[PDB]
Each structure stands twice: as C-alpha cells, then as structure tokens.
Design a binder for this molecule. Structure first.
Ligand code: NA
Length: 406
C-alpha cells in the first residue's frame, strides 16, 4: 500500500508503463526519469530530472522507492541494472551482459545459431570473393546490407559489388511483436501485437520505429503462439540462463510468421516494444505492479495476466521529416477533448514556460482506442485522434487494416 515506483525513460512506452503501474490501488506515485509532457500531466505520475545512476539510487533511498522499471536500451547497455542491484535495489530490466541480446545483432545471431533459435541465416563478409560464393550458395531472395532486398542473384551480386557487407536471409510472411516478461527463469507473455514500421500508408516510404500497433494480433494463432514459445522464447530464456547471465525484464521479440505458421526471429530489440506497449497496456486488467514485483522476486510462474477481450489500436502521430531529423518545437492543439474516446500516450513532447505542449522528437503521440473487434477499435482510435493537430504532423490511416480486410 502507498508504494512509490520509478520508471526510467521518456518515450510513449514509458508513459504507458508508468500509467499502468499507477492504476494499481497499491501505488501512490510513479516517478518517471525524465518523463515527458504526458507523464507530467498524468495523475500519480511525477517527472524527475535525474540522470546519473548514483543519483537515481539515492533518490530511491530518499523516497523509499519499492522498485524501478527500465524502458530504453541505452541505460540497460550502460549497466543501470548492475548498478542498482549492487546497491541492493530492486529493478526490472536486463543486466548489461544480458542486454546484449537486444543491443548487439552480432551477439544475438551468434546466440541464436548456438541455441538453434529460428532466425534469418546471416553472415558478414570481407571482400566479394566469399560474398558472391555465399550468395550463389544460398540463392535468392536474400538481403544485402552495409539495404537491398535482392529478388534475384543478379540483384544480390550487383548489391555486393556496389558495396563490410552483411548478407541475411529474407524472411517471408507477416510481422508480429511477441513481448514477454522474464524473471530469469520463468516467462509471462504479454498480449500479442502487430506494428506498422513503414512510414506511409500501404507500407511505403522508409522504415521507422513503428507508426502504430494493435493487440491482439490474430496472425499469432494458438498454434503460432505455441511454436514461438517452444522454438524461440523458452529456449532463449533457458539459453541465457545456461550462459550464466539470466535475462530479466521485458523481452521484445520481433517475429516473421511464414505462410506455414512457422515463426522466425527478426531480432530482439526496442523497436518491437514501442508503440506496441501502448495498446497492450491499454488491455491489461491485471495489477502490473504485482506482476513486476513477482518477476523481480523470481516468481513469475506464480502470477497471471488477464486481458480485456477488446482489441486496442494505437496510432502514432509523428513530426515532419521523421524518420529523418525531425522538425521540433510546434505547439500541439486539442489534447483536452479526447475524454472517453481513447487514451493519448506521449512520446516526444515537452512543455514550455507558458504551458503549451511542444513537439520534441520523432514520434510525438500514440492514440489508443478500444473496440469489441479490430474494426471498431480502429474507428475508436481514429475518432480519438481526430481533434489533435500540430504543424507538419504525419500519420498512417491504415493502421490494423491487415486484420480488418482478413
Ligand atoms: Na515498434
């Protein structure tokens, strides 16, 4: 009762995590370091401007913080979890070593090859000699990156000559994000979701961190769920344990599901947790604070997650020129009248002295609507987004259409 918690980061995923933690009747305050304009506005959320880990450790001691949750990759790769734990504090997130699973594609591919985790065949190349030899051995389609998706050997050999080259198998099918909580040994899967990482309607334009996601993702049938757990998630958790560096925290698995229902791992990476986390948290009925505490305690097998059966659709509003260097500093209008239509999660927003909310990053907002089916959830999300405006804003109008047409 009256617990105080700490969330590290400033993105839309962190807004959603802090907001959901604050729903617990047992939580009084969730501090967010540094937070954004959305977390400043939320009830029970308090932004704190601390960044140094020893400062955050003393803050936890000063305020009697029960536990800390870490969102983004950078503090994880810097060892925030190691530091907190050496200071005796409770924290949900991977150690610096275990975070390599999400922060180094070399470490992850090598790990996955070792533990026989399905993923794209992958090899890096010195000079064109063995590179052309490899492409001739593997055949097309195949991906050449230094990013050409080569449909023929001619395209692959051409891409090699033009361009250290990275040659990766092309994964066919449909993308899904498979997010799980891990306590080092046990797993508690979050609801499935599907992101839209291309910038523009019709999956055109450049790649992005994700322009909108919905949950559940029907491409992940019970059969696909079982395969993903059996072939990817459970062996990865067991493998990190067997390597002597258990993974703790949210594991963000990007999957490509082929036409046979076979899941292949794209990578484990933050880009499969935002904006995926937002609609997922909008569906979680359970007390997230209790789930996180059980995970920190190594007892995730003692708790369960229960979900609103309604679908949640989240639509990202982004700034002009994203995913390139974004236009910054534009006043955002209309945040006050969304009311019961939906929920607005902030990512790149800040407030100025006069109190206006300003764009302050690439992705600005994620607007989440709930519905009894995916069609209704999509209508709710766009209905809630309708009166938000800022100059140069961009968003896709086709979020979740792959689940509606079908
Ligand atoms: Na994403």
């Amino acid at each position: 009762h009256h617990m105080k918690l700490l969330v590290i980061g400033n993105g839309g995923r962190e807004h959603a995590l802090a907001w959901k933690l604050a729903q617990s009747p047992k939580v009084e305050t969730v501090f967010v370091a540094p937070g954004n304009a959305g977390t400043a506005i939320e009830s029970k959320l308090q932004n704190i401007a601390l960044t140094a880990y020893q400062d955050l450790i003393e803050f936890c001691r000063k305020e009697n913080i029960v536990f800390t949750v870490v969102g983004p990759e950078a503090p994880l790769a810097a060892g925030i979890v190691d530091d907190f734990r050496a200071a005796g504090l409770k924290i949900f997130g991977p150690t610096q070593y275990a975070a390599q699973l999400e922060s180094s594609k070399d470490f992850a591919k090598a790990f996955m090859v070792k533990y026989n985790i399905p993923t794209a065949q992958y090899q890096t190349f010195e000079n064109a000699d063995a590179a052309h030899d490899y492409v001739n051995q593997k055949g097309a389609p195949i991906v050449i990156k230094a990013v050409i998706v080569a449909m023929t050997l001619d395209e692959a050999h051409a891409a090699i000559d033009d361009m250290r080259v990275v040659i990766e198998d092309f994964l066919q099918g449909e993308e899904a994000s498979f997010i799980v909580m891990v306590d080092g040994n046990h797993v508690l899967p979050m609801a499935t979701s599907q992101d839209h990482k291309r910038l523009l309607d019709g999956d055109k334009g450049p790649n992005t961190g994700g322009m909108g996601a919905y949950s559940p993702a029907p491409v992940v049938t019970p059969a696909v769920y079982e395969r993903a757990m059996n072939e990817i998630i459970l062996p990865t958790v067991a493998g990190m344990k067997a390597e002597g560096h258990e993974f703790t925290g949210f594991l963000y698995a990007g999957l490509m599901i082929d036409q046979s229902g076979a899941p292949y791992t794209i990578e484990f990476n933050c880009r499969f947790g935002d904006p995926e986390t937002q609609p997922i948290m909008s569906r979680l009925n359970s007390d997230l604070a209790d789930l996180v505490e059980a995970a920190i305690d190594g007892r995730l097998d003692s708790v369960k997650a229960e979900w609103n059966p309604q679908t949640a659709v989240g639509v990202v509003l982004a700034a002009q020129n994203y995913p390139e260097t974004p236009k910054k500093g534009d006043v955002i209008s209309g945040l006050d009248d969304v009311n019961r239509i939906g929920k607005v999660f902030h990512a790149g927003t800040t407030v100025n002295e006069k109190g206006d909310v300003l764009t302050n990053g690439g992705r600005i907002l994620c607007v989440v609507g709930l519905g009894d089916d995916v069609a209704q959830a999509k209508a709710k999300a766009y209905g809630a987004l309708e009166k938000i405006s800022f100059d140069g804003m961009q968003y896709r109008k086709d979020i979740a259409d792959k689940a509606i047409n079908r």
